[PDB]
Amino acid sequence: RQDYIAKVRYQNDLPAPPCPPKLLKYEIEKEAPQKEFLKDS
């Protein structure tokens, strides 16, 4: 079958990991400062 030459290849390649910048937990995200803050007089 001498016709137009064309290749079909579906692209489902997984991308590289993004490695985004990491958030910093607040002081109120730790249990001991929470205990200090809630027990305030």
């Binding site: 109120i28 929470q34 205990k35 809630l38 027990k39």
Partner: protein
């Protein structure tokens, strides 16, 4: 903490209108690391007193629910 919590309970039994005594009772429950008991007590107080304008109680509920995580919508409210 035990003595203060008992005194808060006696104050609550004497006069139920003392909101400060109940909030101090919840604070003493937090002091004795009784997170679940304090959460149940706070939910009971909120459901009995939905019209009360206890801002610090709602702030403490939001912090507790954020620590729990699953109740994030109640924390937002």
């Amino acid at each position: 903490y035990v003595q203060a919590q008992k005194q808060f309970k006696q104050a609550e039994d004497s006069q139920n209108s003392n909101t400060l005594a109940k909030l101090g009772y919840a604070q003493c429950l937090i002091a004795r690391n009784e997170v679940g008991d304090a959460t149940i007590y706070l939910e009971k107080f909120f459901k009995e007193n939905q019209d009360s304008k206890s801002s610090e109680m709602m702030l403490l509920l939001g912090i507790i629910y954020s620590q729990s995580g699953k109740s994030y919508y109640k924390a937002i409210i």
